Amino acid sequence: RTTSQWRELDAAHHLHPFTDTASLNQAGARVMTRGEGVYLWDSEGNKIIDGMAGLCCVNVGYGRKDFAEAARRQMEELPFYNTFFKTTHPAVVELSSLLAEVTPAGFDRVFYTNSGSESVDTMIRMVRRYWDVQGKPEKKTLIGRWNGYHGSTIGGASLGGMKYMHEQGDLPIPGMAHIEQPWWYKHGKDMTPDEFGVVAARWLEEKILEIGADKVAAFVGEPIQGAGGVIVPPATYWPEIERICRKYDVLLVADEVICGFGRTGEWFGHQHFGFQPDLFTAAKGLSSGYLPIGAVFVGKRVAEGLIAGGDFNHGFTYSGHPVCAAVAHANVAALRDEGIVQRVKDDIGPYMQKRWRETFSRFEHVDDVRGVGMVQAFTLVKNKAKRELFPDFGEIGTLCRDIFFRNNLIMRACGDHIVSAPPLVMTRAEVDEMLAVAERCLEEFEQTLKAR
Amino acid sequence: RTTSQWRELDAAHHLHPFTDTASLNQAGARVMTRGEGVYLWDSEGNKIIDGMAGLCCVNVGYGRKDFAEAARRQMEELPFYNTFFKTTHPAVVELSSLLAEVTPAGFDRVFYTNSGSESVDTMIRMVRRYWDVQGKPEKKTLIGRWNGYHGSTIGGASLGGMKYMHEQGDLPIPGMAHIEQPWWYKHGKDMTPDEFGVVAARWLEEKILEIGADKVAAFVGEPIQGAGGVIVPPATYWPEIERICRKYDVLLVADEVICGFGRTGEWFGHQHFGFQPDLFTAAKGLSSGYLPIGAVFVGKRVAEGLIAGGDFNHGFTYSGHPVCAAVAHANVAALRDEGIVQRVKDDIGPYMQKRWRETFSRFEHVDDVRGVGMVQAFTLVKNKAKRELFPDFGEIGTLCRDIFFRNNLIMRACGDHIVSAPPLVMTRAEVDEMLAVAERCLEEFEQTLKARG
Numbered sequence: 001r002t003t004s005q006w007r008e009l010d011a012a013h014h015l016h017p018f019t020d021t022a023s024l025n026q027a028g029a030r031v032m033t034r035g036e037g038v039y040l041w042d043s044e045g046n047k048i049i050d051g052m053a054g055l056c057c058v059n060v061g062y063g064r065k066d067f068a069e070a071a072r073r074q075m076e077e078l079p080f081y082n083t084f085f086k087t088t089h090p091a092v093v094e095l096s097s098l099l100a101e102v103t104p105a106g107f108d109r110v111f112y113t114n115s116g117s118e119s120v121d122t123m124i125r126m127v128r129r130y131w132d133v134q135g136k137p138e139k140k141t142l143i144g145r146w147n148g149y150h151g152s153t154i155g156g157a158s159l160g161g162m163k164y165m166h167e168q169g170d171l172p173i174p175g176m177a178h179i180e181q182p183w184w185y186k187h188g189k190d191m192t193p194d195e196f197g198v199v200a201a202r203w204l205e206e207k208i209l210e211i212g213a214d215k216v217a218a219f220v221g222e223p224i225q226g227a228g229g230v231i232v233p234p235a236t237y238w239p240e241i242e243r244i245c246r247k248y249d250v251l252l253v254a255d256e257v258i259c260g261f262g263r264t265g266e267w268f269g270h271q272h273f274g275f276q277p278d279l280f281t282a283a284k285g286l287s288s289g290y291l292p293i294g295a296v297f298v299g300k301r302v303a304e305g306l307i308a309g310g311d312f313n314h315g316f317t318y319s320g321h322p323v324c325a326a327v328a329h330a331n332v333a334a335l336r337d338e339g340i341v342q343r344v345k346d347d348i349g350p351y352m353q354k355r356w357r358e359t360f361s362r363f364e365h366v367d368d369v370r371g372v373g374m375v376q377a378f379t380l381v382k383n384k385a386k387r388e389l390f391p392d393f394g395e396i397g398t399l400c401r402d403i404f405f406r407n408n409l410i411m412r413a414c415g416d417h418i419v420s421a422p423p424l425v426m427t428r429a430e431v432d433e434m435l436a437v438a439e440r441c442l443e444e445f446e447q448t449l450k451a452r
Numbered sequence: 453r454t455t456s457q458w459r460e461l462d463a464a465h466h467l468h469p470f471t472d473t474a475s476l477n478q479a480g481a482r483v484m485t486r487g488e489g490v491y492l493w494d495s496e497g498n499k500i501i502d503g504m505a506g507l508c509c510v511n512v513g514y515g516r517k518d519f520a521e522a523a524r525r526q527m528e529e530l531p532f533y534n535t536f537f538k539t540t541h542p543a544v545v546e547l548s549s550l551l552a553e554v555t556p557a558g559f560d561r562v563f564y565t566n567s568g569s570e571s572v573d574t575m576i577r578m579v580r581r582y583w584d585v586q587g588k589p590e591k592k593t594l595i596g597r598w599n600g601y602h603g604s605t606i607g608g609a610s611l612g613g614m615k616y617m618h619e620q621g622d623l624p625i626p627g628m629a630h631i632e633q634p635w636w637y638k639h640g641k642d643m644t645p646d647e648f649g650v651v652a653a654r655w656l657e658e659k660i661l662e663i664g665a666d667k668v669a670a671f672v673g674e675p676i677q678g679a680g681g682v683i684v685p686p687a688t689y690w691p692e693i694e695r696i697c698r699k700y701d702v703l704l705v706a707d708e709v710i711c712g713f714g715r716t717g718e719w720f721g722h723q724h725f726g727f728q729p730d731l732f733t734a735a736k737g738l739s740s741g742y743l744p745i746g747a748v749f750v751g752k753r754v755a756e757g758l759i760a761g762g763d764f765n766h767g768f769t770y771s772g773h774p775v776c777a778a779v780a781h782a783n784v785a786a787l788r789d790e791g792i793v794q795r796v797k798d799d800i801g802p803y804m805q806k807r808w809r810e811t812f813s814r815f816e817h818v819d820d821v822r823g824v825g826m827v828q829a830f831t832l833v834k835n836k837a838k839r840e841l842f843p844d845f846g847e848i849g850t851l852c853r854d855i856f857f858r859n860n861l862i863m864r865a866c867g868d869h870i871v872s873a874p875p876l877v878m879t880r881a882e883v884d885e886m887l888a889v890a891e892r893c894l895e896e897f898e899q900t901l902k903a904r905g
């Protein structure tokens with residue numbers, strides 16, 4: 001099968017996520033065939049640096065034959081059994097046991113899904129059921145943020161703050177509210193980041209008092225907003241959000257679907273930013289994307305609420321899927337026992353953050369260079385001196401991302417934010433290779449900017 | 453690693469779908485370890501007949517080493533790449549091509565998910581986006597049925613008609629409405645099933661006219677209601693539903709998550725019942741449950757509408773997952789090339805339906821014996837003569853289901869409906885084994901009914 005034949009069949013038969021089908025079919029899809037470590041090969045034999053780890057999820061890198069062996073052996077013994085008929089199976093029990101050891105104290109119970117989107121729907125039903133068991137049936141509104149991403153179910157798209165998702169499906173659904181994101185570069189006016197952190201967090205208080213605290217169930221946030229452009233909030237933000245939630249008896253929910261399983265150098269983003277959520281959602285790096293699996297980690301107080309309520313009429317055919325559970329077990333055992341998470345905290349994370357700032361800080365149309373552990377970003381700007389963004393935010397990002405893609409480097413644009421989230425196993429040498437290619441692409445970018 | 457230790461760790465750490473955690477933890481979870489053909493083994497070494505094919509999904513049976521090999525090979529070459537960055541990969545392209553050959557003509561385009569629940573959410577967003585592209589932004593209400601099941605996302609639970617799901621989450625969401633289900637035994641009054649089929653279908657028209665047709669986007673149904681108790685509608689129902697949809701310019705959606713990939717002896721339930729939906733949802737049997745994967749099959753009309761609209765701001769990280777796609781490809785290739793679906797239509801389906809009626813018709817507390825292909829059911833009743841159901845629908849079903857489970861037979865109760873959906877590869881001899889155990893369980897059931905007044 002040629003590149004041509006794969007493109008024609010893709011065009012004729014496959015509808016892609018978050019894509020304009022007509023424009024993709026006219027352009028021709030890029031066909032990825034093989035992965036190894038931090039590298040991909042396409043159908044034309046291009047070797048590509050995957051600076052996005054599939055979709056911020058291939059945390060141990062490509063080529064784990066041990067994961068394929070764990071999948072094969074589980075699929076041969078018991079490919080599926082359901083967790084609905086008062087039934088369980090070894091793989092889901094062993095994974096649940098291992099996950100309780102790497103999650104913080106008070107996170108003993110896990111509910112399994114197929115995806116981050118399903119984890120978020122589960123978390124919404126759980127937080128509403130929790131407040132019904134407490135005898136507060138009005139306490140149902142969840143608060144999220146503009147430019148937050150919580151997946152693509154009806155519930156997750158509603159809780160997310162992407163207007164472009166709201167406009168497709170009549171979203172958000174009721175009992176959903178949104179506050180502004182803690183994007184210092186745009187909203188931080190004449191304030192330091194730390195001052196801005198407190199102002200941005202107090203938008204949650206303003207929103208709670210406008211709705212009424214007795215109607216507010218939860219505040220939900222990514223510790224770092226991922227799909228929104230790696231928006232790293234100031235150090236003062238999360239402690240103030242937490243204070244506000246505790247003051248108004250609002251559950252605090254971390255969406256750990258990106259940050260989870262080592263991306264920040266801690267096991268979870270909320271540990272890096274110093275807040276204690278009541279629940280958190282995970283997927284992606286839970287299996288390093290080798291198989292679909294998600295989870296909701298339920299803290300003791302919410303777990304006791306759900307259990308005291310009797311039947312929880314929620315769950316998926318493939319909840320606790322044995323093969324997915326065996327793969328997630330191999331992945332979490334590798335992250336811990338091979339020191340991959342520890343390595344992000346004390347070796348590759350500090351190296352990446354230093355080298356990312358050394359590489360990009362000098363460019364005249366780059367600003368707000370930021371990141372932690374192995375997630376990093378910057379913003380393309382029209383005038384750095386005035387902190388002026390390009391108009392039609394996203395047009396210049398597209399141009400830069402296409403230069404990267406043409407030069408066999410995967411880094412993505414969210415608007416005019418450029419983001420990177422490579423495999424956590426990336427070597428220092430591979431960080432320097434990636435940065436040399438990105439640096440040359442940015443010199444091409446600046447020259448092309450001036451040329452128009 | 454003992455039964456004991458697995459039960460303690462499950463109790464301490466695992467929250468199960470659709471379960472009362474406190475009551476499960478006190479009872480102890482039954483630990484399933486091994487599967488082969490139609491059989492399971494538990495941690496105590498019980499050999500069990502799986503009359504439910506996992507959860508109506510393990511259509512080719514347990515023990516396909518070829519599927520494990522396809523998974524292993526794909527996971528070694530390219531375990532994951534996303535379909536978001538103007539990117540694709542061979543496994544999803546090959547699966548999409550094979551799926552177009554086994555779907556009806558005019559279903560060329562497939563959107564991939566991880567689950568039937570995500571397929572249903574995708575279908576809701578697609579139906580609403582379609583009507584926006586047509587310039588009809590109020591055409592947004594989807595109609596389902598009481599006792600319909602459309603999964604467990606907020607969207608799917610809303611569209612489904614399980615009040616026990618609606619009461620947890622403040623559901624349904626807006627633009628969801630429900631009509632009564634075509635359950636002849638309960639609602640069919642003085643009528644033949646065929647007459648009742650027309651009346652039950654016309655409840656859709658009455659509901660469309662009550663809401664206003666310009667506000668109605670779609671009618672969605674399972675060809676056979678699965679989780680609701682294998683409610684098999686009369687032959688007249690689906691053609692009338694389709695007429696009503698066409699009359700009022702309402703999209704017709706089949707939820708094929710159970711019926712799909714051969715359960716009825718056709719590839720899809722809507723083919724057996726003789727209706728042409730505009731879209732249908734699939735999962736379960738798509739991979740025979742060997743890996744999580746769902747899909748929405750989009751007909752030409754809706755595909756043209758979605759494509760004319762430009763960006764579809766919808767999809768999942770694991771949409772088109774390569775390993776799941778390679779396994780789904782092996783499963784659909786086996787269903788077609790090994791004659792498994794054809795064998796349901798021609799051989800095992802007719803045998804099961806005949807033997808199911810022969811076995812269960814004689815019992816004084818069994819009525820409405822029904823089924824098609826390899827899905828079958830009956831209803832436990834208080835008084836057969838008067839067609840009276842037990843009060844507290846579900847209590848007598850629980851008793852019967854527990855007798856089955858205690859006798860190493862998995863058949864489920866939905867309320868007082870007993871349901872069976874075994875692997876499609878079940879032999880005639882395995883059908884007779886399953887029915888002999890179920891028949892003895894029903895004699896025990898009747899005796900303990902009478903004993904306990």
Ligand SMILES: *Cc1c(COP(=O)(O)O)cnc(C)c1O
Pocket residue numbers: 114115116117118120149150151152222226227255256257258283284767768769770
């Ligand atoms: C990717 C993502 C999700 C959704 O996960 P799927 O597995 O794509 O359904 C949810 N929340 C966040 C923060 C994510 O980054």
Ligand SMILES: *Cc1c(COP(=O)(O)O)cnc(C)c1O
Pocket residue numbers: 315316317318566567568569570572601602603604674678679707708709710735736746
């Ligand atoms: C099982 C089922 C679903 C939901 O599928 P998951 O894969 O459990 O999310 C949806 N619709 C019908 C008819 C089903 O039977």
